Amino acid sequence: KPWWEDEWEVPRETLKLVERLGAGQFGEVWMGYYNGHTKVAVKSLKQGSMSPDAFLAEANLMKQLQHQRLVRLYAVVTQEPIYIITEYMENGSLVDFLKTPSGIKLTINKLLDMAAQIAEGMAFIEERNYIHRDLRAANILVSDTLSCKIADFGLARLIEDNEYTAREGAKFPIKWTAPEAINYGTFTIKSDVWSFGILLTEIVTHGRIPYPGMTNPEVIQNLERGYRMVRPDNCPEELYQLMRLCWKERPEDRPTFDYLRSVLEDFFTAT
Numbered sequence: 001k002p003w004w005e006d007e008w009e010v011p012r013e014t015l016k017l018v019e020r021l022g023a024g025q026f027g028e029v030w031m032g033y034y035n036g037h038t039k040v041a042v043k044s045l046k047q048g049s050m051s052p053d054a055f056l057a058e059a060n061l062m063k064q065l066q067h068q069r070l071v072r073l074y075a076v077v078t079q080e081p082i083y084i085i086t087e088y089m090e091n092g093s094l095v096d097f098l099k100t101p102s103g104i105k106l107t108i109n110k111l112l113d114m115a116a117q118i119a120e121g122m123a124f125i126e127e128r129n130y131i132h133r134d135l136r137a138a139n140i141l142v143s144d145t146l147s148c149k150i151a152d153f154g155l156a157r158l159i160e161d162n163e164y165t166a167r168e169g170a171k172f173p174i175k176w177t178a179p180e181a182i183n184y185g186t187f188t189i190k191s192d193v194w195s196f197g198i199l200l201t202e203i204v205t206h207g208r209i210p211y212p213g214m215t216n217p218e219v220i221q222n223l224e225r226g227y228r229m230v231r232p233d234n235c236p237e238e239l240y241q242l243m244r245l246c247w248k249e250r251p252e253d254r255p256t257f258d259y260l261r262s263v264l265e266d267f268f269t270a271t
């Protein structure tokens with residue numbers, strides 16, 4: 001649909017960039033206001049750093065993935081500089097939040113609460129036949145009411161035939177990414193389920209890097225022996241055995257996200 005008919009297209013005048021939250025190779029992320037009053041986040045594409053089509057493809061995918069537990073597309077500005085405008089999350093990234101004075105005070109109960117919110121969001125993506133491919137606490141955003149939403153759909157894909165295969169020269173964080181995806185470039189909703197397992201260690205350890213003390217190839221060697229991540233400090237055994245389910249050798253043996261959600265809601269109301 002063309003910009004002059006696109007319901008998501010907004011005039012650049014409607015936007016006011018106030019505070020810069022982040023800067024990178026491909027652009028910036030700002031806190032701003034839309035029409036004066038509505039706090040928004042504005043993702044800024046650095047002219048030349050990457051194709052506008054590639055940049056905008058994320059927005060188009062978000063048009064299709066609307067849910068309360070997913071960070072919502074607000075608008076676009078499709079003339080340079082290109083903007084993707086989104087729902088603003090006041091407490092920022094989960095990995096950061098968990099380290100603040102407030103994050104630090106969270107009881108294990110509230111931790112399992114958030115973990116369930118994240119699983120509920122992924123359960124939506126699962127039913128829509130999408131995958132995320134970058135599921136990790138840095139890509140979970142937290143709201144002013146200590147609410148969690150999925151974000152960063154740059155790598156997300158619609159899955160026609162069960163499986164997305166990437167180029168054999170493509171790279172992924174080895175600690176968050178399922179063996180089959182690292183090894184064969186084959187991604188599935190069950191690959192996200194594996195990432196979810198890792199994300200759980202990040203929650204219970206308040207944002208610590210997974211596999212304490214291990215390099216990437218040590219992590220690969222161990223997994224192949226049949227070992228999984230060592231029990232994190234202060235991790236309920238129930239939660240750890242749930243991470244274990246997420247890390248099963250065969251993708252199809254890994255639980256669904258709806259299952260993971262129901263289980264986490266039980267742990268939550270038990271504590």
Ligand SMILES: COc1cc(Nc2nc(N[C@@H]3CCCC[C@@H]3N)n3nc(-c4cccc(O)c4)nc3c2C(N)=O)cc(OC)c1
Pocket residue numbers: 021022023029041043058071084085086087088089090091092093138141151152153154
């Ligand atoms: C400084 O960290 C704060 C961030 C935020 N808020 C946000 N930060 C980010 N990116 C950050 C990059 C560097 C630090 C880590 C963050 N992730 N994204 N990024 C998005 C976003 C991601 C992918 C696609 C898209 O369209 C938007 N939305 C957001 C977003 C939001 N929707 O509010 C709020 C704060 O207040 C206390 C502190």
